[PDB]
């Protein structure tokens, strides 16, 4: 990892861009010659190999957090995996040639970068990145950060620990899939319960759920069993609070939260991915990709449309970029 030759890094590249807020089918345009971002001294420049989509990407593009967004135009995409091509002068953890992955935006809703992952090259803070596990493809790696870190942070906020029970609302979703795997394999839960629709229950069990509850047939909050931790990933805290043991904790990522539930927004941290590395390397915790992934870089509008349709059953990843 000595520096790349200077003129080997381009100053323009291909990216997807929107210049006004709206629906992705209306505003998202391919630009063959966008500026490659200059890095700050605590950043690296990455040759992007794969990027994954998230709901935040299209909600941001609709203007949902314009108050605290970065200036338009925007190149979307939070999740990335790729190869380091340049390091800033304060970077100590990465060298040129390192294969890396992460969620670009430390504070998801406050000044996310103008230059996201749906581009050939992007700038990333050292602190958001981790070394890619050798046994994961770039597609697989790209699929992970936002969802696995959100699962981890919520479980830590809820104080999950060995021997405790957990109920996950929305187990088949992108975050919920990892809540289940982390609860069972990383946090040592004695019992993991989760809700989903009828066709998704075998997925819940495959991932680690001891009890898969069909929300189309029964109401979890009416069960006599109550849980040490309830992690709401759908926006049902008014019911979630009825399923927790006295003295337990309820956390949600979809507000407004009914007290005593709390809402949080992920802080993206490469350190979390590093802490999870051995579970990813042993396959105890697995990526969950949509069968339609990957989408080629030419097909980013279609990728968004599929994510937005709610028909996705796993992560929507864009590759090759």
Swiss-Prot record:
Binding residue positions for substrate: 59
Binding site for NADP(+): 59, 174-175, 197-200, 215, 253, 264-266, 311-312
Reactions the enzyme catalyzes: 4-hydroxy-2,5-dimethyl-furan-3(2H)-one + NADP(+) = 4-hydroxy-5-methyl-2-methylenefuran-3(2H)-one + NADPH + H(+)
A GO MF term: furaneol oxidoreductase activity
UniProt-listed Enzyme Commission number(s): 1.3.1.105
EC category: oxidoreductase
Transmembrane region(s): none
Superkingdom assignment: Eukaryota
Matches recorded under Pfam families: ADH_N, ADH_zinc_N_2
Keyword vocabulary terms for this entry: NAD, NADP, Oxidoreductase
Keyword Iron: no
Function in brief: Enone oxidoreductase involved in the biosynthesis of 4-hydroxy-2,5-dimethyl-3(2H)-furanone (HDMF or furaneol), the key flavor compound in strawberries.
Subunit structure and binding partners: Monomer.
Homology family: Belongs to the zinc-containing alcohol dehydrogenase family. Quinone oxidoreductase subfamily.
Protein name: 2-methylene-furan-3-one reductase
Species this protein is from: Fragaria vesca
């Amino acid at each position: 990892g000595a520096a790349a030759p200077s003129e080997s890094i381009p100053s323009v590249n291909k990216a997807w861009v929107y210049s006004e807020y709206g629906k992705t089918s209306d505003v998202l345009k391919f630009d063959p010659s966008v500026a490659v971002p200059e890095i700050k001294e605590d950043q690296v420049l990455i040759k992007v190999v794969a990027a994954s989509l998230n709901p935040v990407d299209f909600k941001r593009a609709l203007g949902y957090f314009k108050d605290t967004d970065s200036p338009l135009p925007t190149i979307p995409g939070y999740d990335v995996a790729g190869v380091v091509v340049k390091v800033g002068s304060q970077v100590t953890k990465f060298k040129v040639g390192d294969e890396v992955y992460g969620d670009l935006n430390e504070t998801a809703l406050v000044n996310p970068t103008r230059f996201g992952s749906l581009a050939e090259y992007t700038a990333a803070d050292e602190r958001v990145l981790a070394h890619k596990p050798k046994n994961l493809s770039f597609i697989e790696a790209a699929s992970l950060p936002l969802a696995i870190e959100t699962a981890h942070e919520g479980l830590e906020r809820a104080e999950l620990s060995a021997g405790k029970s957990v109920l996950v609302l929305g187990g088949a979703g992108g975050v919920g899939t990892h809540i289940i795997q982390l609860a069972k394999h990383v946090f040592g839960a004695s019992k993991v319960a989760a809700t989903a629709s009828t066709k998704k229950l075998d997925l819940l069990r495959t991932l680690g759920a001891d009890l898969a509850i069909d929300y189309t047939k029964e109401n979890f909050e009416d069960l006599p069993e109550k849980f040490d931790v309830v992690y709401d990933a759908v926006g049902e805290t008014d019911k979630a609070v009825k399923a927790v043991k006295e003295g337990g904790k309820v956390v949600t990522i979809v507000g407004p939260a009914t007290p005593p539930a709390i809402l949080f927004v992920l802080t993206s941290k490469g350190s979390v991915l590093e802490k999870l590395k051995p579970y990813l390397e042993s396959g105890k915790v697995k990526p969950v990709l949509d069968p339609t992934s990957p989408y080629p870089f030419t097909k980013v509008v279609e990728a968004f449309g599929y994510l937005e349709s709610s028909r996705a059953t796993g992560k929507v990843v864009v590759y090759p970029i």
